[PDB]
Amino acid sequence: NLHVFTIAELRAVTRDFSMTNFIGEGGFGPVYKGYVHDLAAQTVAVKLLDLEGGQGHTEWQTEVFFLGQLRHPHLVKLIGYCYEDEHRLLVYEFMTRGSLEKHLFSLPWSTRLKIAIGAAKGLAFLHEAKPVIYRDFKTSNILLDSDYKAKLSDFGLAKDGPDETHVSTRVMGTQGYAAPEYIMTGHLTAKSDVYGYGVVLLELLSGRKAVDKEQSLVEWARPYLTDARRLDRVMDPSLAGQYSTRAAHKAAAVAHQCVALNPKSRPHMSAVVDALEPLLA
Ligand SMILES: Nc1ncnc2c1ncn2[C@@H]1O[C@H](COP(=O)(O)OP(=O)(O)OP(=O)(O)O)[C@@H](O)[C@H]1O
Ligand SMILES: [Mg+2]
């Protein structure tokens, strides 16, 4: 199952958390490239809890719980963890192309479709199970391997699904991706995840960030997604001649349904996979 590491071992693994091994960070803490020697030898990612930050043991234990039981091809693999006095660390497989937001903010139309399909399969797997609500579905939580295969990562805010119709919890997440009905009510469902997936799809189609202080991508591009004649106002100009009108229009319409403000109008993620997969043919 999961391997238990010591601080001393992760110090060896990451060249004592050298700044040259820095590969990214978030609200939990910074992440360092590392190498495990003869568990097979491989390049790993080591995430360290920042003890002055806004996160802590709860997010750590959530990832260990969910990633230690969840195994799918579009989900990042958790190799092990460290729990040593006040310190908390997480060890994942190294995703060689990092997180999607750094590539988006150049990416071929076919590559973007492939990323959107892979991320959708990961999310569909969580929803169809013991269903799991991803909650923090955003661009920077999609990681990429050498072939740009997309994998969901960072299950710090992951929650179990509801005879109930919703889950009552704190409003947590990231502006622009968190579902509006969830923000306003504190009621979380799997349909809340579909809104954030729609936002990421919107970002892949337009090259624009969800929020940029016209500041909100969804609100601005919302009325332009249903009409194939208006595609030029939403499609990334760096994507020109790469897509057929039908493929971009169907992707745009899928995005539009996913960012509906009525959660009952959003599609199931498995229907999203079925709409998008043919576009790659
Ligand atoms: N397995 C990995 N392979 C390559 N890079 C990674 C990996 N895990 C994390 N990173 C890099 O470090 C960044 C931060 O990781 P992660 O999203 O897990 O941090 P976090 O603090 O939990 O973020 P949040 O603030 O959303 O909670 C990632 O977006 C990614 O760029
Ligand atoms: Mg996190």
Author numbering: 2 to 39, 45 to 111, 117 to 140, 142 to 174, 177 to 227, 233 to 300
The authors write:
Furthermore, bacterial growth was measured to determine the bacterial proliferation inside plants, showing that transgenic plants exhibited significantly higher bacterial proliferation than that in wild-type plants at 3 days. These results suggest that ScRIPK plays role in regulating drought tolerance and disease defense in Arabidopsis. Like the typical structure of protein kinases, ScRIPK-KD contains a small N-lobe, composed of five β-sheets and an α-helix, and a large C-lobe, composed of six helices, an activation loop, and a catalytic loop.
In the ScRIPK-KD-ATP complex structure, Y169 and E170–M172 formed a deep cavity to clamp the adenine group of ATP and a magnesium ion bond with the catalytic base D237 and the β- and γ-phosphates of the nucleotide. Other residues, including G99–G101, K124, Q132, S176, K179, K221, and S223, may contribute to the stabilization of the nucleotide through hydrogen bonding. The catalytic spine is completed by the adenine base of ATP, which binds to the V103 (from the beginning of the β2-strand), A122 (from the conserved Ala-Xxx-Lys of the β3-strand), and L226 (from the middle of the C-lobe β2-strand). This activation loop contains three phosphorylation sites, namely, T250, S253, and T254, as indicated by the electron density. In addition, we determined the location of the DFG-Phe residue and calculated its distance from two conserved residues (K124 and L144, labeled as D2 and D1, respectively) in the N-terminal domain, revealing that it belongs to the DFGin group. By analyzing the Ramachandran region annotation (A, B, L, and E) for the X, D, and F residues of the ScRIPK X-DFG motif and the DFG-Phe χ1 rotamer, we found that the ScRIPK-KD structure was in the BLAminus cluster. Furthermore, the regulatory spine (R-spine), which determines the positioning of the protein substrates so that catalysis occurs, was assembled in the ScRIPK-KD structure. The R-spine contained residues from the activation segment and the αC-helix, which assembled by the L155 (from the beginning of the β4-strand), L144 (from the C-terminal end of the αC-helix), F238 (from the activation segment conserved DFG motif), along with H/YRD-Tyr217 of the catalytic loop.
